[PDB]
Amino acid sequence: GADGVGNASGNWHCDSTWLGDRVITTSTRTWALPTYNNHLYKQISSASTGASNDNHYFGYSTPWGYFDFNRFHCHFSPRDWQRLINNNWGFRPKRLNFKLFNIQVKEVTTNDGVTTIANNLTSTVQVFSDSEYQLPYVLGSAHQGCLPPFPADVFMIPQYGYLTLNNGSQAVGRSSFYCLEYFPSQMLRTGNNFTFSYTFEEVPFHSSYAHSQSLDRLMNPLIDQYLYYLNRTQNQSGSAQNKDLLFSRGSPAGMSVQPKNWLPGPCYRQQRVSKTKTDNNNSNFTWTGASKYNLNGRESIINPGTAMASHKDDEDKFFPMSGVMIFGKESAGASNTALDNVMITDEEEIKATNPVATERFGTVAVNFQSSSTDPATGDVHAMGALPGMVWQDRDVYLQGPIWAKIPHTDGHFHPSPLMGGFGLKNPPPQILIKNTPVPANPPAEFSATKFASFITQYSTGQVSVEIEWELQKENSKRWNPEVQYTSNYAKSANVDFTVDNNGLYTEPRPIGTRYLTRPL
Amino acid sequence: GADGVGNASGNWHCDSTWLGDRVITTSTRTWALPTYNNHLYKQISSASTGASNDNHYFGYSTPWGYFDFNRFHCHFSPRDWQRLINNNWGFRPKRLNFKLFNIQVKEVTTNDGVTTIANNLTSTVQVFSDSEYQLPYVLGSAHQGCLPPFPADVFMIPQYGYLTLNNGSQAVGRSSFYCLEYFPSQMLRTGNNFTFSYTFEEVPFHSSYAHSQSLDRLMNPLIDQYLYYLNRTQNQSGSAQNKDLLFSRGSPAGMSVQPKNWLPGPCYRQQRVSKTKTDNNNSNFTWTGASKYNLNGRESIINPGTAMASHKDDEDKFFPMSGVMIFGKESAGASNTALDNVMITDEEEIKATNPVATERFGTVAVNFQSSSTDPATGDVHAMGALPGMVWQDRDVYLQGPIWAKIPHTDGHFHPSPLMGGFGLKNPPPQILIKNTPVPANPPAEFSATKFASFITQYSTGQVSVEIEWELQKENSKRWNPEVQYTSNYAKSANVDFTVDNNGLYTEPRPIGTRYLTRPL
Amino acid sequence: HSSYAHSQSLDRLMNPLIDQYLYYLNRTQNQSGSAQNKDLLFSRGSPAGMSVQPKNWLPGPCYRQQRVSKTKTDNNNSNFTWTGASKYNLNGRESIINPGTAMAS
Amino acid sequence: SPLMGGFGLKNPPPQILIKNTPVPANPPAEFSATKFASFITQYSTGQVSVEIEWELQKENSKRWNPEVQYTSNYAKSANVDFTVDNNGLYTEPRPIGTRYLTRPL
Numbered sequence A, B: 001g002a003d004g005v006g007n008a009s010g011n012w013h014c015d016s017t018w019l020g021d022r023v024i025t026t027s028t029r030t031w032a033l034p035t036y037n038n039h040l041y042k043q044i045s046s047a048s049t050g051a052s053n054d055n056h057y058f059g060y061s062t063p064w065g066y067f068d069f070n071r072f073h074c075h076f077s078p079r080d081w082q083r084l085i086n087n088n089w090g091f092r093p094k095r096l097n098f099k100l101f102n103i104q105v106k107e108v109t110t111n112d113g114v115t116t117i118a119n120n121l122t123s124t125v126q127v128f129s130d131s132e133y134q135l136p137y138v139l140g141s142a143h144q145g146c147l148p149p150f151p152a153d154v155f156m157i158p159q160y161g162y163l164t165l166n167n168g169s170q171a172v173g174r175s176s177f178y179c180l181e182y183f184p185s186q187m188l189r190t191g192n193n194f195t196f197s198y199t200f201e202e203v204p205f206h207s208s209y210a211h212s213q214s215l216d217r218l219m220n221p222l223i224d225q226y227l228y229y230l231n232r233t234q235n236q237s238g239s240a241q242n243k244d245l246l247f248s249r250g251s252p253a254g255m256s257v258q259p260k261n262w263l264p265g266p267c268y269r270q271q272r273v274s275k276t277k278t279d280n281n282n283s284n285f286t287w288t289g290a291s292k293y294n295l296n297g298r299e300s301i302i303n304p305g306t307a308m309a310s311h312k313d314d315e316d317k318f319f320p321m322s323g324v325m326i327f328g329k330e331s332a333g334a335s336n337t338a339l340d341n342v343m344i345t346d347e348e349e350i351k352a353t354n355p356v357a358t359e360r361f362g363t364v365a366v367n368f369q370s371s372s373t374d375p376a377t378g379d380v381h382a383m384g385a386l387p388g389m390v391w392q393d394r395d396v397y398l399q400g401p402i403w404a405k406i407p408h409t410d411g412h413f414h415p416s417p418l419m420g421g422f423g424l425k426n427p428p429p430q431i432l433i434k435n436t437p438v439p440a441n442p443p444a445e446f447s448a449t450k451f452a453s454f455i456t457q458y459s460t461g462q463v464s465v466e467i468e469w470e471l472q473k474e475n476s477k478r479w480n481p482e483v484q485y486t487s488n489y490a491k492s493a494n495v496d497f498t499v500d501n502n503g504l505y506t507e508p509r510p511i512g513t514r515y516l517t518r519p520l
Numbered sequence C: 001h002s003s004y005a006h007s008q009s010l011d012r013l014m015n016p017l018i019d020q021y022l023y024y025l026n027r028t029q030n031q032s033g034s035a036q037n038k039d040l041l042f043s044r045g046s047p048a049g050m051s052v053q054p055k056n057w058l059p060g061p062c063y064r065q066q067r068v069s070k071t072k073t074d075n076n077n078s079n080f081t082w083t084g085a086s087k088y089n090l091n092g093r094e095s096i097i098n099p100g101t102a103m104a105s
Numbered sequence D: 001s002p003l004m005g006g007f008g009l010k011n012p013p014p015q016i017l018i019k020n021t022p023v024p025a026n027p028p029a030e031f032s033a034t035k036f037a038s039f040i041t042q043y044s045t046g047q048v049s050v051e052i053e054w055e056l057q058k059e060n061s062k063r064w065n066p067e068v069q070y071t072s073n074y075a076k077s078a079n080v081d082f083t084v085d086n087n088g089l090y091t092e093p094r095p096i097g098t099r100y101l102t103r104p105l
């Protein structure tokens, strides 16, 4: 971008526009970027520490920061989310426009015990988008540091670091190291700005609806089937019990025994825990009772895991130990905070098609019955994909992620990001940004030793992201009224999704998207 | 319409189409029309009867029936109403298309004690629209007999009758008598059909919103005014009480005493009654405590009367004796039915601008204060229009009326129909319909006496009304979520706005339109 | 200019054959059971109760005036025209309102 | 693929709904608002026709020996398969699948 100390390089574009089948969100925020690692790349790992084998790692931390808008509230105000979710069966991102501007680099000089800041007019900030995905993709891990939900909040840019192969806390020859400078980047003084655009690949619309039928209630409740099933293996009060083979035809009084076309979704059972502590076992079972996967001798909690309904009817007090997305309140501490400082999602709407998360998928025969041997069956707790299965993916939330990069593998299977959202082969590129090192005064005599004395600085500016979203309109012939997300009409001390008397914006609950209904 | 015994003259067009700024409702129903008054026009009145002076009348009943779609649920399904009200700040009718067809005239012959019906193929039904408004306008009095809310219900056509001037139970020379035949009408046999279209005049969009500010809270809560008001007429702890004139400037701590630009709406006070009977007086006060107007020595209850808020904050248990629209449940008896068989509307949203219906409008000076004479004031219970007043009209309901004819008078004042809806100078014309008399066998010898022997018959067919409605879209920058009409998510024995196990459609509550919000 | 009388009145606009779908509070007590007891009883608009039917319209404005008879014997024995008159007050000066608001005689 | 067998279709042949239109019996002489509940008893009859085009995958087999083929039974009996009996009742005496020709894997 071209021109002045004295001249803004961008305006403030923060707004929504609804246009029939499209909605265009624009959001702009003011950021702050410190100097990280003192302009150094450090090797990092779990060495010392005392970490268990399931926590070892090797990687590198970087002098760079990055931009992250991978959360719905970076784009949708609460009211817009409401508009979205109460009138559409779905939506997807189509295109994006990104803007960095009004940059201002500042130097900090400290004497005492006391601190002066001034402008350093001839200083630059550097930027690039990793558009060929040459860097480890660190979005889609649900990190904090995204654009804040509230447009008036200033935010600090997160620091980029990444991991590679590790054997315990050591590295392997196959471990990759990346230097960000080695990339062409744009260098901006206070006059300049950065822009780029991006188009999203074609992706299925996110399902913003619950079903109003369930897999097991698809039949016509008036008519028999023409199909028969073995109903009894003994009579039938003719005294007493005699071996028999008796067959019945499908009938509305026996909807549990009717032949059908479809199976419910996959299942990886999880441990059921109550919100009233008195119901639970008196031990610490989370790691030990947890559903985990085992990768190169390292255990990892499956969380949130397969899309599964959180609880069956009437049991809203239970939840899978690690099968629901959980947001912290703005009072929550980092670790071992209490139940009332968190917000647990509920994915109950999918119980029309998806197994409940804390129960068996079902039952299977396990032997050959005969006069000598009694029929046996077993419980199935982990069921992979079977032809004929159908299921609903995890819901998204106003404060959850939007997308993730599908790993570059030979094989995926339904690569919808398990934490919720859109899987993208070629996702929105990472956007990296750094303050250029500015040497302090060198000595009078040459020295070859790497320069280690710098003027202390940081930068600030605005960033703007515009996304176009396509909508799937609702076409429902449903006669009665829908469940609709609504704010509460009763009176209170504070308004939901507002700032308080100290100016702290709060999000008092998660909001999903499943209010409108479809048939199956 | 042209053609066959064997040939339908219309199809079934029942559907909604949403199109950005327009929504087009089509509804079609199946009707039944008996022979009324045996093809006679009768003079009718309150003579004998024992009626009080406030109930006397004179008029005429007619052999004709009529069509009435003047209720929102004749056009909007519950789900559509929901769509309407949760996304628009307003709406109005623009144009209409009406269709009578598939007519079938039948003769009834009874011997015994037992009854045979057959087709009378060569019989006609007659129809016309009173498009020059030459007939007494009987729509907009909230009569029953409109198209039913539920498309599968068959309905009987109401009978047309009208009133004229009466002096007690007698007539005056100025009294008008109308013969409907004297009008050209279309004569339809089983093959034929009737159609006409109509355009609505320009009218203000109905306000489907509550305000989120009130008249008395329009100021900037941070800043003083530059304006002053007399604050004290005595000091001010300098002992003891001394005459003084002390002036203060408008201030956020004194929002009740700040000069302002606007006044709240008009007021005609009504008697406050509680839903818990124990609160009320032990008498029958409705006529005797009622707000009434007096017209030519005849009293009439003002009901619903001036648009006024039903109750102030926290007092949802009170309601004006005759200032709220009240719908009957499908269990309600015609007279003296209990509280739980009715549904009382609530117009509480308008308390931002409109006086509460059971309180004074305010207080007025009534004398000249002096050292000798103490300042007096009086309560104002009935306040007409004052320059600077602003107000909100009564809300409409999914089951309330749509429009009424503005009377043809020299003078109206804000002629919005007090029961709610659109006032129309030139409203949708009345549509009249009758089975043509079919003589029974005459005698063999002439007789001049009016024929009085007829073949018994009635007719049935379909009717279709299509209305185009223009929408006022919402443009709100409100950050937090709105109150939205929503059905209840908790489980129950029946679904709202559905048929039961005997196939009776029920409407379990009124729904207004005021959910979205505006600023004032 | 309206050179016509109406042949209907504001309070007689309804269809005299059909009920309304609208209800109004009819009684605040029953109803012979023996005594008087607090109650809330609602009735629907009906041709037998045209004085209690909901309606859309109100009659015109009103500024009441003193009724006087053409047969003198009916009237009060005093001179009440200025003193019983409907007057407006303008800058401390009274003026008889005459003929005043359009009202039926 | 529908587990009971057949073709799964995103956008399958639409449901086709049909009903006899209500035909009121004689109404009363005086208006009543209550649900109309008296009807002339009726029913209907007619023909319906469905035509479907099916594409075939022809067999291209180099298999030298003869195939298993669905065949009716040559031995004599009291009734013919897939026929009506002496009371005119059509019967289907067995299921027939479709897997007779063979492929290599």
Ligand SMILES: Nc1ncnc2[nH]cnc12
Pocket: A203, A204, A414, A415, A416, A417, A421, A422, A423, A424
């Ligand atoms: N959300 C998603 N993104 C990309 N591919 C998918 N395949 C199934 N769901 C998907």
Ligand SMILES: Nc1ncnc2[nH]cnc12
Pocket: B203, B204, B414, B415, B416, B417, B421, B422, B423, B424
């Ligand atoms: N609803 C309405 N119809 C016609 N004129 C009006 N003037 C004010 N409100 C009106």
Ligand SMILES: Nc1ncnc2[nH]cnc12
Pocket: D001, D002, D006, D007, D008, D009
């Ligand atoms: N029968 C079938 N119909 C539709 N999709 C299928 N995919 C695999 N088998 C199928």
Ligand SMILES: Nc1ccnc(=O)[nH]1
Pocket: A413, A414, A415
């Ligand atoms: N990836 C998938 C496999 C099967 N079905 C899907 O919808 N998606």
Ligand SMILES: Nc1ccnc(=O)[nH]1
Pocket: B413, B414, B415
């Ligand atoms: N009729 C009216 C008079 C004054 N203001 C209005 O909005 N309408």
